Curated annotation (Swiss-Prot), chain A:
Pathway annotation from the record: Carbohydrate biosynthesis; Calvin cycle
Pfam families associated with the record: PRK
GO BP terms in the entry: reductive pentose-phosphate cycle; response to cold
Alphabetized CDD domains for the sequence: PRK
Regulation of its function: Light regulated via thioredoxin by reversible oxidation/reduction of sulfhydryl/disulfide groups.
Protein name: Phosphoribulokinase, chloroplastic
Organism listed in the record: Arabidopsis thaliana (Mouse-ear cress)
Lineage: Eukaryota, Viridiplantae, Streptophyta, Embryophyta, Tracheophyta
Length: 343, 349
């Protein structure tokens, strides 16, 4: 059987990096399909196929322009086709999946997708429709706060450079009602949420480099033991920097606490600051628990393959890599059961 | 050991009736796959497996709605998969083939297909792709005139009774560009073309029952000796009705004539009118030549098996039955030719 993983994110920045981090622990390099469309959003690897949910846009870019709607609006997406095709792939059936051409903003003729071992649906509405949601074996939500969203556009984007600060944040809040109505409530269905906030260690930092990252983990989910620090289920803050581990400004600060998140029980691990050298990453990993690693240091090693990645110096890469490991552990138990069941 | 026949025909009129007249000739009764999907379009016989090319649609009904594209458009069909699976079947390889559901409009899980003695692929685009065209051992194109499609929609199809004439003719017009561009040109690749036109015997008739049917037979094709009437190559008109064969109104009228069709030499046989007594059918069959019958009255006998079929009293039934007998003859010769070749190769080893 194929196992299906939802990834809810805005397409701009972290989702690409998050997806690359998830692909690297699941298997080999994910590449576009061999022939066919050069503007295909599909990424294919030996174990995983990544489907961009833009392909299920029911509304052409110019159709949306003529319409009241935007890409966030459910009017603009075809959840019937999305449900049916995701459902078919999970049962080992190949699907003819249309292609949303981002360059031309057009719907291209479809591509035949073969059923993978690991299917990741990634985009704006993976958890929006309940039929789709019931198919997922694991759900991810990458939640960027608006403060950091703004910083990245200014500090880390070249397309936005033609626009003023006024115009860029005008657009952000102009899209905020649709986002709050249609994207943000998907958090409640996620098994793992990575919330990205400005750091508290530096007062008035808006640069997007030092960040407060929260890893919210649902409890009671079968095959998914949440990560914890020192004493599972208690409330802990933890500064690793000391006599034996020296840090630069501002350093590292960890928080671990239970919580109630959309009327579900969760465990929250939090890292504020950035790693200014590699010993701190090694030290942090050695003190976390329930990381779903195969050997001591795997989180570090898996991060070291993508040192150039954005967020590799802070909690973004650390928690995205941990979430990828937990997912692997989970599908192994799903698949273990499945393969033994077949026997 | 698989012969592949191409049947290009428009969706909704006489394509279903045609395919059933061929399976009667090719072998026993053709039934759906045992159990399985109730809406599967595959018909299975002892000798024949017929594949509906709708199965290789890439856009489903609703996808076609939102992509603003018809089922006649190449963009809505996956010709790569169609090609791959036709060559596999021709190579004795079974395929798992998706099913296009006509009631739901969706693509459903696939059905495994075993390689048959005779594989007929019928639908919109059997000759549209040269790779798939290259696998055909024979090809047919059913060319219903625009006047007769409308007649059949009004006179025959009960489903069209919900629509008024404007919607019916608008829908025809809505698909006309794609038909002219992508379907109609496949005629030129067809070894046999059946062209269904309004009658001339009844002036102004438009009721789709009295028909002028042209059987267009491509010349110079190996194992295919076209039907002819009295004197091969001449231009003949024949009214068999008379004092020794009595007919009703309007009667029978045949035309036999050579022609050039897309710059290939063709021999075309025409029936205008309709049969009202069985003697008329037996008399016509008895006077034609190169029918590839195995005995006197095979055509008549084959048509009486399916007497309540539409077009059973005009040239549509007559010439479809005969195309079946020509094809049967052709694959008998090709199988024997292929079998002689294999034995020679086996003596060589």
């Amino acid at each position: 059987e194929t196992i299906v993983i939802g990834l809810a994110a805005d397409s701009g920045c972290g989702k690409s990096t998050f997806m690359r981090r998830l692909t690297s622990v699941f298997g080999g390099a994910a590449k576009p399909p061999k022939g066919g469309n050069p503007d295909s959003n599909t990424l294919i690897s030996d174990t995983t196929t990544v489907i961009c949910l833009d392909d299920y846009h029911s509304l052409d870019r110019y159709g949306r322009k003529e319409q009241k709607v935007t890409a966030l609006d459910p009017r603009a997406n075809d959840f019937d086709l999305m449900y049916e095709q995701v459902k078919a792939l999970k049962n080992g059936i190949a699907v003819e999946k249309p292609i949303y051409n981002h360059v031309t903003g057009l719907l291209d003729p479809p591509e035949l997708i073969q059923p993978p071992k690991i299917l990741v649906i990634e985009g704006l509405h993976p958890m929006f429709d309940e039929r789709v949601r019931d198919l997922l074996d694991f759900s991810i939500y990458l939640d960027i706060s608006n403060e950091v969203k703004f910083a990245w556009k200014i500090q880390r984007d070249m397309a936005e450079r033609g626009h003023s600060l006024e115009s860029i944040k005008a657009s952000i809040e102009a899209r905020k009602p649709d986002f709050d109505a249609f994207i943000d409530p998907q958090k409640q269905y996620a098994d793992a949420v990575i919330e990205v906030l400005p750091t508290t260690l530096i007062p008035d930092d808006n640069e997007g480099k030092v960040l407060r990252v929260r890893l919210i983990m649902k409890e009671g989910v079968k095959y998914f033991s949440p990560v914890y620090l020192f004493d599972e289920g208690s409330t802990i803050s933890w500064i690793p920097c000391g006599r034996k581990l020296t840090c630069s400004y501002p350093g590292i600060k960890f928080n671990y606490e239970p919580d109630s998140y959309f009327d579900h029980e969760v465990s929250v691990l939090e890292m504020d600051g950035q790693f200014d050298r590699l010993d701190e990453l090694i030290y942090v990993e050695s003190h976390l628990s329930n990381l779903s690693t195969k050997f001591y240091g795997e989180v570090t090693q898996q991060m070291l393959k993508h040192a150039d990645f954005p967020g590799s110096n802070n909690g973004t890469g650390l928690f995205q890599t941990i979430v990828g490991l937990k997912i692997r552990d989970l599908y192994e138990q799903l698949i273990a059961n499945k393969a033994t069941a077949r026997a």
